[PDB]
C-alpha cells in the first residue's frame, strides 16, 4: 500500500496550434489567468478560457470542437469567469459568466453553431453559475421545484 503510482498510457496529446496561439494572445494582458475544466456532462468536453477567449476541446482527443472571443461594451475586453455545460431542446451548449468593468453578462453559448444565443445583464460581478433545470412548463419533471419556478 505504500506507493500507488499512476501509469501514463499515452504520449501528450497536444492541442491544435490555433488553440495554443489563441490562449497565448491574451497573456500579453498581465491580469489574464488561463483557466480550464472538464465538463461534468455526458458530452466528453473540456473548456479553456483566457481573458475574453473561450476554447472548447474534446476531453479524449484534445481536438478543438468550438471557440469564441467575447466582446465587451467597454474598451476593456470581458473576462470569462464561470462556465457550465447546459443541454436544452436537443442542443448542447455552455452557460458563460462574463465580468466587465461596469458589470457582468450571463451568456448562453450554443456549441453546435459556435455562437451566443441569449445574453442577460447581471446586477454585480458574477462568480459562479449553476443550471437547475433545462426546460419549463407544468410537467411531471418540474414538480420538485417551487410553483414560481415552474413558470
Amino acid at each position: 500500500m505504500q506507493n500507488l503510482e499512476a501509469q501514463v498510457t499515452g504520449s501528450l496529446v497536444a492541442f491544435p496550434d490555433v488553440t495554443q496561439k489563441a490562449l497565448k494572445e491574451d497573456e500579453i494582458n498581465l491580469d489574464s489567468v488561463l483557466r480550464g475544466k472538464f465538463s461534468t456532462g455526458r458530452t466528453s468536453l473540456a473548456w479553456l478560457a483566457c481573458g475574453p477567449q473561450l476554447e472548447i476541446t474534446n476531453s479524449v482527443t484534445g481536438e478543438r470542437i468550438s471557440a469564441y472571443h467575447f466582446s465587451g461594451l467597454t474598451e476593456r475586453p470581458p473576462v470569462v469567469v464561470a462556465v457550465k455545460e447546459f443541454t436544452w431542446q436537443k442542443k448542447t451548449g455552455l452557460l458563460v459568466g462574463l465580468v466587465e468593468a461596469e458589470g457582468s453578462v450571463l451568456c448562453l453559448y450554443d456549441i453546435g453553431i459556435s455562437k451566443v444565443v441569449k445574453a442577460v445583464v447581471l446586477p454585480g460581478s458574477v462568480t459562479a453559475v449553476e443550471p437547475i433545470i433545462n426546460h419549463g412548463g407544468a410537467s411531471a419533471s418540474t414538480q420538485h421545484l417551487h410553483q414560481s419556478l415552474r413558470w
Binding site: 490555433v18 496561439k21 489563441a22 471557440a67 472571443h69
Partner: protein, 119 residues
C-alpha cells in the same frame, strides 16, 4: 465576355468590372495613375460565382485579400464589399499572407426567393 444569342446574328462584347470610387470618377481628369492606387494583386478573385435575376446578372468574387465582392453586370457597379476575416479567429500573421486556397459556392432557392453563399 458576352456572346450573342445562338439564333441571332451579333458581335461578342467585353466589359471589365472595376471598383471605381465616385471620387476616382470625378477626379479622373486631374491626377496621374501612380497616386490612384492601382488595384494590387491582392484584389485578384480566387473563386467566382454568378446568379441571374429578372433582367440582371450578379457576380460574386472571393479575392486574395480575403474580401467577398458583389457586382451588377447591368449597372456595372460593385453593389457590396464584405471582409471575410471579420468571421475568422484572426492570427495577426493571416492579414499579411495571400489567401490562395479559398473557395466560393452559390445556391438559390426558387421557392423562397433566397440566395445562399458558401465560403
Amino acid at each position: 465576355i458576352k456572346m450573342p444569342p445562338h439564333d441571332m446574328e451579333g458581335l461578342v462584347t467585353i466589359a471589365e468590372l472595376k471598383q471605381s470610387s465616385v471620387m476616382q470618377r470625378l477626379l479622373t481628369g486631374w491626377m496621374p495613375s501612380s497616386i490612384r492606387g492601382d488595384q494590387g494583386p491582392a484584389h485578384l478573385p480566387v473563386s467566382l460565382a454568378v446568379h441571374t435575376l429578372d433582367h440582371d446578372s450578379y457576380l460574386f468574387a472571393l479575392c486574395q485579400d480575403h474580401k467577398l465582392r458583389m457586382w451588377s453586370y447591368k449597372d456595372q457597379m460593385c453593389l457590396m464589399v464584405a471582409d471575410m476575416l471579420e468571421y475568422v479567429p484572426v492570427s495577426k500573421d493571416i492579414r499579411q499572407t495571400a489567401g490562395t486556397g479559398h473557395k466560393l459556392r452559390l445556391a438559390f432557392s426558387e421557392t423562397l426567393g433566397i440566395l445562399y453563399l458558401g465560403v
